Amino acid sequence: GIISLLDEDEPQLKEFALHKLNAVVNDFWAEISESVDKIEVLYEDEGFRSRQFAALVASKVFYHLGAFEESLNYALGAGDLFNVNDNSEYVETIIAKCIDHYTKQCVENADLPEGEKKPIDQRLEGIVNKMFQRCLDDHKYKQAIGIALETR
Amino acid sequence: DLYSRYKKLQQELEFLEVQEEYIKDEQKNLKKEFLHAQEEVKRIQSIPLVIGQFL
Amino acid sequence: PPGGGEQEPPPPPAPQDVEMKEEAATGGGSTGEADGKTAAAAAEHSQRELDTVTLEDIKEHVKQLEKAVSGKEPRFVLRALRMLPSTSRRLNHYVLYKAVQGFFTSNNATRDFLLPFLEEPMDTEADLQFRPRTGKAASTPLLPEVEAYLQLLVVIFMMNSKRYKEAQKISDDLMQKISTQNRRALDLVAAKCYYYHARVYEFLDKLDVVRSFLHARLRTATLRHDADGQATLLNLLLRNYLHYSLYDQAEKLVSKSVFPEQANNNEWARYLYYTGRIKAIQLEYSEARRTMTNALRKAPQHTAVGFKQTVHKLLIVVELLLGEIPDRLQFRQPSLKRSLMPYFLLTQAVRTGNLAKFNQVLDQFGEKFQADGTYTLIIRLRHNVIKTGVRMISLSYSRISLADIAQKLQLDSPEDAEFIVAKAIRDGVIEASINHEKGYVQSKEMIDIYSTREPQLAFHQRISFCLDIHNMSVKAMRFP
Amino acid sequence: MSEKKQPVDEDNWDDDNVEDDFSNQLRAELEKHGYKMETS
């Protein structure tokens, strides 16, 4: 019942609250489900500069209750802290949502055929060639031509 | 190369996915055609008839 | 000595025959089954494994006793090796070591020496393919051995099993990941060992950290590979998160899903009993009575013996709070009889409205209720019986006076009777009108439910229930 | 079943369902209903 600690508008209590969460978030994944409305207070707060990290904990609760595309929306505005983590499983699940959203947008862009372009976030297209640098550095040529067929 | 076949393998996946409505729509038609064939054999011979003794 | 000495040699060949061919025919058979097709799974040997392990869990396990040295554990775990068809030589070497027990002086390699033995499939260089067979080699020797329960220094070996088999979990998540179909075969094996996880801790201390380790395997099975896997993990949750506080009751809302499809059969039938006791603490009776009734009728096959009987005992507990229950000896079993005797006469005092009889049952039979933890209802069941007593009278009579039903139900006073009938109307229990002067209660027959209304409206749920089974039969017909 | 924590923790029997309703209510009863003869 630490949810009541979020009522205070003073920032230094929030970093100690999330310091508790992200460590035990594995066991408390069920507890974060009721923190939705009170996380948005921090995410929409202008004086709260951790909204990049607050978008991650907002993606964990929605992933717990069955929401996916909404977590991908928060992944956009999550800044560089979201795309800097390549570790374990969480990297391959987000790129499966992001690159599929990227490759279905590029096919849509080729149907314009020119002009009246849809908005393309620099973060979703930015990790394309960024993670593609991991290919040429790994020297494996077989999938180096594969990304070009993906994005078309 | 593994993404190549990964883009190859969903073809026959989706090719058999459209093969689902292939048979399902075909078999129900033919089913109604077989039910129409039930009216055929029941139509024959209709009238008239003649009595006979089974041996 | 000569009589008992000559009778020692014959038995050990029996584990050298059937127990050999247990994992020789199934494991050697599941080899090609897990190399391809692998549809689903199926891999029916993993379900045949349910007909072995559970059969071995009585006799013989790996051991036993029987009059061997318990050398079957090191035998199959060494010299995997393996390679192309020479794996038969490994089974041949398993036959060669059978004479070692019968000829030379037999030595027990279990326990202390089992620590490097579980590393041998990795040390044999290499496995090289099936972790479930080595998971079986890290379980079937050790997990059926847990049934000894000596508690001294071998529990850490049961923990060492949960260690090296967590190294099999390391090979579970890292290896494959693409059309595995071994995980779905392991979902039966990973279930069991995770069950033995919970069981071994219960003898020492309930697991605080494994609760966090449970959500690990829980969440990571979604969405990548989940078949029957998260259900068994959700069973671990609702099992212990019930017996231990807190908040775990309402947790079922965000988890479900369901999780579909319910597997395997009776395995999900008991799950409705788990959440059944939960929803019983939510005080909602109607959803609790249907999930408890469905828990008995969906549960095959037993025997033996009281494992299904004891779970059925506490299952009809929700019927005590329903207010409508018959005598429960129609559910009695001669084995469950002796255990249900303090819980038997309880419901016999529920059918009656006597306080002196009901309070005497709580005093003498309250000792048996301490192990069940059912004391939550005994305070609210007094209000349940007074509703059954008034329903018995209100259904038997058109008009019922408050003064005549006062002492008959021994409410003893007119004022609290006005409070009960008021709350009875609030709960929709009674339709009786009341004429207050002294006062008295004058009711009338309730009708117009008739025919054209209730049966045809209920038949909307009956046919919608039946027409779905038409699809259930077609779906089950499409697999063959 | 036997998994999880399941293992961790005519006849007169059929008529006994109805027969126990006689135990707590109205006995059988002969004597009392036989005493009601000369009561009124």
Side-chain angles (χ1 to χ4, degrees), chain B residues 6-24:
Chain B
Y6 173 72
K7 296 301 181 180
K8 301 171 190 171
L9 292 180
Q10 77 283 4
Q11 270 67 359
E12 65 275 6
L13 193 152
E14 297 182 354
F15 293 168
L16 294 180
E17 180 178 359
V18 73
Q19 284 307 115
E20 298 301 324
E21 296 179 351
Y22 182 95
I23 164 183
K24 290 292 287 187

PDB file of all heavy atoms in Angstrom, chain B residues 6-24:
ATOM      1  N   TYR B   6      12.941 -17.349 -43.407  1.00  0.00           N
ATOM      2  CA  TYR B   6      11.898 -16.785 -42.559  1.00  0.00           C
ATOM      3  C   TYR B   6      10.892 -15.961 -43.349  1.00  0.00           C
ATOM      4  O   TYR B   6       9.723 -15.897 -42.950  1.00  0.00           O
ATOM      5  CB  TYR B   6      12.518 -15.927 -41.453  1.00  0.00           C
ATOM      6  CG  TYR B   6      11.506 -15.169 -40.624  1.00  0.00           C
ATOM      7  CD1 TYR B   6      10.681 -15.830 -39.725  1.00  0.00           C
ATOM      8  CD2 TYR B   6      11.378 -13.791 -40.742  1.00  0.00           C
ATOM      9  CE1 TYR B   6       9.755 -15.140 -38.965  1.00  0.00           C
ATOM     10  CE2 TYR B   6      10.454 -13.094 -39.986  1.00  0.00           C
ATOM     11  CZ  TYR B   6       9.645 -13.773 -39.099  1.00  0.00           C
ATOM     12  OH  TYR B   6       8.724 -13.084 -38.345  1.00  0.00           O
ATOM     13  N   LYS B   7      11.313 -15.327 -44.442  1.00  0.00           N
ATOM     14  CA  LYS B   7      10.393 -14.684 -45.369  1.00  0.00           C
ATOM     15  C   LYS B   7       9.871 -15.634 -46.438  1.00  0.00           C
ATOM     16  O   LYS B   7       8.919 -15.286 -47.143  1.00  0.00           O
ATOM     17  CB  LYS B   7      11.069 -13.480 -46.037  1.00  0.00           C
ATOM     18  CG  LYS B   7      11.434 -12.358 -45.077  1.00  0.00           C
ATOM     19  CD  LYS B   7      10.201 -11.829 -44.359  1.00  0.00           C
ATOM     20  CE  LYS B   7      10.557 -10.692 -43.414  1.00  0.00           C
ATOM     21  NZ  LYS B   7       9.363 -10.166 -42.694  1.00  0.00           N
ATOM     22  N   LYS B   8      10.484 -16.812 -46.590  1.00  0.00           N
ATOM     23  CA  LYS B   8       9.960 -17.826 -47.500  1.00  0.00           C
ATOM     24  C   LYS B   8       8.858 -18.670 -46.871  1.00  0.00           C
ATOM     25  O   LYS B   8       7.869 -18.987 -47.541  1.00  0.00           O
ATOM     26  CB  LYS B   8      11.093 -18.739 -47.978  1.00  0.00           C
ATOM     27  CG  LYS B   8      12.216 -18.026 -48.708  1.00  0.00           C
ATOM     28  CD  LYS B   8      13.388 -18.966 -48.940  1.00  0.00           C
ATOM     29  CE  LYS B   8      14.611 -18.224 -49.449  1.00  0.00           C
ATOM     30  NZ  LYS B   8      15.808 -19.108 -49.471  1.00  0.00           N
ATOM     31  N   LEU B   9       9.007 -19.048 -45.602  1.00  0.00           N
ATOM     32  CA  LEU B   9       8.182 -20.084 -44.990  1.00  0.00           C
ATOM     33  C   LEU B   9       6.740 -19.660 -44.731  1.00  0.00           C
ATOM     34  O   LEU B   9       5.868 -20.530 -44.657  1.00  0.00           O
ATOM     35  CB  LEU B   9       8.820 -20.564 -43.682  1.00  0.00           C
ATOM     36  CG  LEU B   9      10.136 -21.327 -43.855  1.00  0.00           C
ATOM     37  CD1 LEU B   9      10.703 -21.759 -42.510  1.00  0.00           C
ATOM     38  CD2 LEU B   9       9.948 -22.527 -44.771  1.00  0.00           C
ATOM     39  N   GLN B  10       6.457 -18.367 -44.588  1.00  0.00           N
ATOM     40  CA  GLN B  10       5.078 -17.949 -44.367  1.00  0.00           C
ATOM     41  C   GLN B  10       4.241 -17.979 -45.640  1.00  0.00           C
ATOM     42  O   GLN B  10       3.017 -17.832 -45.558  1.00  0.00           O
ATOM     43  CB  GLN B  10       5.015 -16.542 -43.754  1.00  0.00           C
ATOM     44  CG  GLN B  10       5.258 -15.401 -44.729  1.00  0.00           C
ATOM     45  CD  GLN B  10       6.720 -15.229 -45.063  1.00  0.00           C
ATOM     46  OE1 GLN B  10       7.560 -16.012 -44.630  1.00  0.00           O
ATOM     47  NE2 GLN B  10       7.034 -14.192 -45.832  1.00  0.00           N
ATOM     48  N   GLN B  11       4.868 -18.147 -46.804  1.00  0.00           N
ATOM     49  CA  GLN B  11       4.126 -18.325 -48.046  1.00  0.00           C
ATOM     50  C   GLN B  11       3.215 -19.544 -47.961  1.00  0.00           C
ATOM     51  O   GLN B  11       1.990 -19.395 -47.931  1.00  0.00           O
ATOM     52  CB  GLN B  11       5.083 -18.438 -49.237  1.00  0.00           C
ATOM     53  CG  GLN B  11       5.424 -17.099 -49.894  1.00  0.00           C
ATOM     54  CD  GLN B  11       6.250 -16.181 -49.011  1.00  0.00           C
ATOM     55  OE1 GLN B  11       6.582 -16.516 -47.875  1.00  0.00           O
ATOM     56  NE2 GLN B  11       6.573 -15.001 -49.529  1.00  0.00           N
ATOM     57  N   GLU B  12       3.796 -20.747 -47.900  1.00  0.00           N
ATOM     58  CA  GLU B  12       2.971 -21.950 -47.811  1.00  0.00           C
ATOM     59  C   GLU B  12       2.122 -21.952 -46.547  1.00  0.00           C
ATOM     60  O   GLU B  12       1.067 -22.595 -46.509  1.00  0.00           O
ATOM     61  CB  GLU B  12       3.834 -23.214 -47.872  1.00  0.00           C
ATOM     62  CG  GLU B  12       4.782 -23.411 -46.701  1.00  0.00           C
ATOM     63  CD  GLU B  12       6.094 -22.681 -46.879  1.00  0.00           C
ATOM     64  OE1 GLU B  12       6.231 -21.924 -47.863  1.00  0.00           O
ATOM     65  OE2 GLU B  12       6.992 -22.871 -46.035  1.00  0.00           O
ATOM     66  N   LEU B  13       2.567 -21.250 -45.503  1.00  0.00           N
ATOM     67  CA  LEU B  13       1.707 -20.983 -44.357  1.00  0.00           C
ATOM     68  C   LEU B  13       0.431 -20.281 -44.807  1.00  0.00           C
ATOM     69  O   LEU B  13      -0.677 -20.808 -44.658  1.00  0.00           O
ATOM     70  CB  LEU B  13       2.465 -20.146 -43.322  1.00  0.00           C
ATOM     71  CG  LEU B  13       1.904 -19.976 -41.908  1.00  0.00           C
ATOM     72  CD1 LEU B  13       3.050 -19.749 -40.933  1.00  0.00           C
ATOM     73  CD2 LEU B  13       0.911 -18.826 -41.831  1.00  0.00           C
ATOM     74  N   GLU B  14       0.576 -19.078 -45.369  1.00  0.00           N
ATOM     75  CA  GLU B  14      -0.564 -18.354 -45.914  1.00  0.00           C
ATOM     76  C   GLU B  14      -1.164 -19.032 -47.139  1.00  0.00           C
ATOM     77  O   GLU B  14      -2.358 -18.851 -47.402  1.00  0.00           O
ATOM     78  CB  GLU B  14      -0.161 -16.918 -46.264  1.00  0.00           C
ATOM     79  CG  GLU B  14       0.286 -16.091 -45.070  1.00  0.00           C
ATOM     80  CD  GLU B  14       0.642 -14.665 -45.447  1.00  0.00           C
ATOM     81  OE1 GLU B  14       0.641 -14.350 -46.656  1.00  0.00           O
ATOM     82  OE2 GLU B  14       0.920 -13.857 -44.535  1.00  0.00           O
ATOM     83  N   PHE B  15      -0.377 -19.802 -47.893  1.00  0.00           N
ATOM     84  CA  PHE B  15      -0.932 -20.525 -49.034  1.00  0.00           C
ATOM     85  C   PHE B  15      -1.860 -21.638 -48.566  1.00  0.00           C
ATOM     86  O   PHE B  15      -2.878 -21.926 -49.202  1.00  0.00           O
ATOM     87  CB  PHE B  15       0.190 -21.085 -49.916  1.00  0.00           C
ATOM     88  CG  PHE B  15       0.999 -20.032 -50.624  1.00  0.00           C
ATOM     89  CD1 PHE B  15       2.191 -20.359 -51.248  1.00  0.00           C
ATOM     90  CD2 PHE B  15       0.567 -18.716 -50.666  1.00  0.00           C
ATOM     91  CE1 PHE B  15       2.937 -19.393 -51.900  1.00  0.00           C
ATOM     92  CE2 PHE B  15       1.308 -17.747 -51.313  1.00  0.00           C
ATOM     93  CZ  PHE B  15       2.495 -18.085 -51.933  1.00  0.00           C
ATOM     94  N   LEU B  16      -1.523 -22.281 -47.444  1.00  0.00           N
ATOM     95  CA  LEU B  16      -2.447 -23.239 -46.845  1.00  0.00           C
ATOM     96  C   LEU B  16      -3.530 -22.552 -46.022  1.00  0.00           C
ATOM     97  O   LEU B  16      -4.563 -23.168 -45.740  1.00  0.00           O
ATOM     98  CB  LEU B  16      -1.693 -24.246 -45.975  1.00  0.00           C
ATOM     99  CG  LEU B  16      -0.736 -25.208 -46.682  1.00  0.00           C
ATOM    100  CD1 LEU B  16      -0.070 -26.141 -45.680  1.00  0.00           C
ATOM    101  CD2 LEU B  16      -1.470 -26.005 -47.752  1.00  0.00           C
ATOM    102  N   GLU B  17      -3.317 -21.293 -45.632  1.00  0.00           N
ATOM    103  CA  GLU B  17      -4.359 -20.548 -44.935  1.00  0.00           C
ATOM    104  C   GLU B  17      -5.518 -20.234 -45.872  1.00  0.00           C
ATOM    105  O   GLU B  17      -6.689 -20.287 -45.475  1.00  0.00           O
ATOM    106  CB  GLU B  17      -3.777 -19.267 -44.335  1.00  0.00           C
ATOM    107  CG  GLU B  17      -4.777 -18.416 -43.572  1.00  0.00           C
ATOM    108  CD  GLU B  17      -4.146 -17.182 -42.955  1.00  0.00           C
ATOM    109  OE1 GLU B  17      -2.921 -16.997 -43.111  1.00  0.00           O
ATOM    110  OE2 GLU B  17      -4.875 -16.396 -42.315  1.00  0.00           O
ATOM    111  N   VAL B  18      -5.212 -19.905 -47.131  1.00  0.00           N
ATOM    112  CA  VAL B  18      -6.268 -19.721 -48.120  1.00  0.00           C
ATOM    113  C   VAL B  18      -6.765 -21.074 -48.613  1.00  0.00           C
ATOM    114  O   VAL B  18      -7.855 -21.174 -49.191  1.00  0.00           O
ATOM    115  CB  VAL B  18      -5.770 -18.833 -49.280  1.00  0.00           C
ATOM    116  CG1 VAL B  18      -4.797 -19.593 -50.165  1.00  0.00           C
ATOM    117  CG2 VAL B  18      -6.941 -18.295 -50.090  1.00  0.00           C
ATOM    118  N   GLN B  19      -5.985 -22.134 -48.388  1.00  0.00           N
ATOM    119  CA  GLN B  19      -6.471 -23.481 -48.662  1.00  0.00           C
ATOM    120  C   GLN B  19      -7.471 -23.949 -47.614  1.00  0.00           C
ATOM    121  O   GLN B  19      -8.113 -24.986 -47.807  1.00  0.00           O
ATOM    122  CB  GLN B  19      -5.308 -24.471 -48.749  1.00  0.00           C
ATOM    123  CG  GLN B  19      -4.525 -24.399 -50.049  1.00  0.00           C
ATOM    124  CD  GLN B  19      -5.415 -24.529 -51.271  1.00  0.00           C
ATOM    125  OE1 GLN B  19      -5.542 -23.596 -52.064  1.00  0.00           O
ATOM    126  NE2 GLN B  19      -6.035 -25.692 -51.428  1.00  0.00           N
ATOM    127  N   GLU B  20      -7.618 -23.212 -46.512  1.00  0.00           N
ATOM    128  CA  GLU B  20      -8.645 -23.545 -45.535  1.00  0.00           C
ATOM    129  C   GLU B  20     -10.031 -23.204 -46.070  1.00  0.00           C
ATOM    130  O   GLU B  20     -10.937 -24.043 -46.069  1.00  0.00           O
ATOM    131  CB  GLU B  20      -8.374 -22.813 -44.217  1.00  0.00           C
ATOM    132  CG  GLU B  20      -7.050 -23.188 -43.566  1.00  0.00           C
ATOM    133  CD  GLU B  20      -6.950 -24.671 -43.261  1.00  0.00           C
ATOM    134  OE1 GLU B  20      -7.979 -25.275 -42.895  1.00  0.00           O
ATOM    135  OE2 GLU B  20      -5.840 -25.232 -43.386  1.00  0.00           O
ATOM    136  N   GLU B  21     -10.208 -21.971 -46.552  1.00  0.00           N
ATOM    137  CA  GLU B  21     -11.481 -21.594 -47.157  1.00  0.00           C
ATOM    138  C   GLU B  21     -11.676 -22.271 -48.506  1.00  0.00           C
ATOM    139  O   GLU B  21     -12.800 -22.319 -49.020  1.00  0.00           O
ATOM    140  CB  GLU B  21     -11.564 -20.074 -47.303  1.00  0.00           C
ATOM    141  CG  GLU B  21     -11.550 -19.317 -45.981  1.00  0.00           C
ATOM    142  CD  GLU B  21     -11.598 -17.811 -46.173  1.00  0.00           C
ATOM    143  OE1 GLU B  21     -11.479 -17.355 -47.328  1.00  0.00           O
ATOM    144  OE2 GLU B  21     -11.753 -17.089 -45.166  1.00  0.00           O
ATOM    145  N   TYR B  22     -10.598 -22.789 -49.097  1.00  0.00           N
ATOM    146  CA  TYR B  22     -10.656 -23.551 -50.340  1.00  0.00           C
ATOM    147  C   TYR B  22     -11.589 -24.746 -50.185  1.00  0.00           C
ATOM    148  O   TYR B  22     -12.612 -24.837 -50.871  1.00  0.00           O
ATOM    149  CB  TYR B  22      -9.248 -24.000 -50.740  1.00  0.00           C
ATOM    150  CG  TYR B  22      -9.133 -24.761 -52.045  1.00  0.00           C
ATOM    151  CD1 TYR B  22      -8.823 -24.102 -53.228  1.00  0.00           C
ATOM    152  CD2 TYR B  22      -9.289 -26.140 -52.086  1.00  0.00           C
ATOM    153  CE1 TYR B  22      -8.701 -24.792 -54.421  1.00  0.00           C
ATOM    154  CE2 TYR B  22      -9.169 -26.839 -53.272  1.00  0.00           C
ATOM    155  CZ  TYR B  22      -8.874 -26.159 -54.437  1.00  0.00           C
ATOM    156  OH  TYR B  22      -8.753 -26.848 -55.622  1.00  0.00           O
ATOM    157  N   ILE B  23     -11.242 -25.666 -49.285  1.00  0.00           N
ATOM    158  CA  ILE B  23     -12.021 -26.878 -49.060  1.00  0.00           C
ATOM    159  C   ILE B  23     -13.339 -26.559 -48.363  1.00  0.00           C
ATOM    160  O   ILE B  23     -14.401 -27.023 -48.788  1.00  0.00           O
ATOM    161  CB  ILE B  23     -11.216 -27.913 -48.251  1.00  0.00           C
ATOM    162  CG1 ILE B  23     -12.156 -28.979 -47.680  1.00  0.00           C
ATOM    163  CG2 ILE B  23     -10.408 -27.231 -47.155  1.00  0.00           C
ATOM    164  CD1 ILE B  23     -11.469 -30.003 -46.815  1.00  0.00           C
ATOM    165  N   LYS B  24     -13.278 -25.771 -47.286  1.00  0.00           N
ATOM    166  CA  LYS B  24     -14.448 -25.499 -46.457  1.00  0.00           C
ATOM    167  C   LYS B  24     -15.600 -24.913 -47.266  1.00  0.00           C
ATOM    168  O   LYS B  24     -16.764 -25.252 -47.028  1.00  0.00           O
ATOM    169  CB  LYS B  24     -14.081 -24.557 -45.306  1.00  0.00           C
ATOM    170  CG  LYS B  24     -13.194 -25.198 -44.253  1.00  0.00           C
ATOM    171  CD  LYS B  24     -13.942 -26.278 -43.495  1.00  0.00           C
ATOM    172  CE  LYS B  24     -14.954 -25.672 -42.539  1.00  0.00           C
ATOM    173  NZ  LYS B  24     -15.579 -26.708 -41.672  1.00  0.00           N
TER     174      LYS B  24
END
